[PDB]
């Protein structure tokens with residue numbers, strides 16, 4: 399039986415849970431199914447990576463390029479201006495989520511376009527990443543490590559830059575065979591220089607589309623009908639729309655930002671809400687009982 403009161407990880411004051419009996423019920427299903435039924439579906443930026451460190455604001459995948467030695471101060475000035483005008487839209491309370499899609503497409507297209515101008519070589523990503531201030535959440539070795547040890551599928555589903563994301567996890571030692579990455583991948587020219595992006599754009603609001611266009615992945619995993627989903631946004635709740643059959647799904651949300659405004663909405667939509675939390679120990683605690 400599961401008792402959240404007897405799990406010291408769940409007592410941390412950052413842990414918010416609207417409906418604990420329900421959460422206990424889901425975690426109980428997870429444990430019953432064991433490794434054989436489990437898979438993980440997860441965002442990356444600010445979910446598997448830190449929102450802030452000591453006492454500092456950490457980079458997203460996109461920020462890593464924004465801030466590197468290959469990008470001019472004027473290009474960063476333009477990128478910042480883009481952020482200021484489009485982030486106001488993203489967080490606009492009057493506009494419907496659907497109204498925001500065209501704007502989000504414009505933002506990722508424009509900002510990607512500025513980086514294509516800067517001339518980013520694939521060869522240089524390794525060093526750019528090594529030099530960056532990127533940080534994985536506390537407990538990531540264990541997270542990725544228990545998962546790989548048990549062969550649990552991990553679908554990292556990111557609106558960031560896939561090449562960057564992969565280099566971060568590769569340099570961290572945790573890009574194992576069980577880890578599949580779906581993101582915005584860079585398209586390179588004859589000289590190995592960035593010239594555009596592959597596929598359809600993934601942004602914060604359209605993860606349902608991507609989730610459905612990954613049929614091959616999810617149908618090989620028919621038997622993994624127990625899911626842990628981790629996300630930092632309302633948009634991330636759609637990441638599991640492609641899943642063949644669901645028996646138990648647990649949705650864990652990192653609330654990093656806009657805490658007062660969004661807490662009630664996050665508590666309503668995610669089963670567990672983690673408020674300004676820089677570690678993976680709640681999820682590690684559930685894997686410990688499960689695997």
Ligand SMILES: [Pb+2]
Pocket residue numbers: 441443602629630631634
């Ligand atoms: Pb997200």
